[PDB]
């Protein structure tokens with residue numbers, strides 16, 4: 001699913017010495033859920049990069 | 050939740066604010082006993098405050 005795929009992408013970004021990122025998407029309703037999940041994960045910064 | 054007696058300067062300021070803005074006092078001690086700032090929860094569950 002998209003929710004876990006974003007987590008896998010972020011975990012991969014943790015390696016390779018990557019900390020700064022920026023995402024571009026479209027207006028599809030399914031993509032907006034991904035954007036909201038990414039924003040919530042960014043707001044969830046108690047652990048991680 | 051036994052009733053304790055707390056006083057000092059902060060409570061006096063609170064009483065002054067309540068009298069100026071027609072408020073009420075419901076002072077209750079924090080169960081955690083700490084300020085409760087941002088902390089890392091167990092097993093990386095989520096971000097929250099205590």
Ligand SMILES: *[C@@H]1O[C@H](CO)[C@@H](O)[C@H](O)[C@H]1NC(C)=O
Nearest residue numbers: 066067068069070071072073
């Ligand atoms: C204070 O505000 C309360 C609002 O619940 C009001 O009933 C009361 O008359 C006010 N007292 C004064 C002195 O203005």
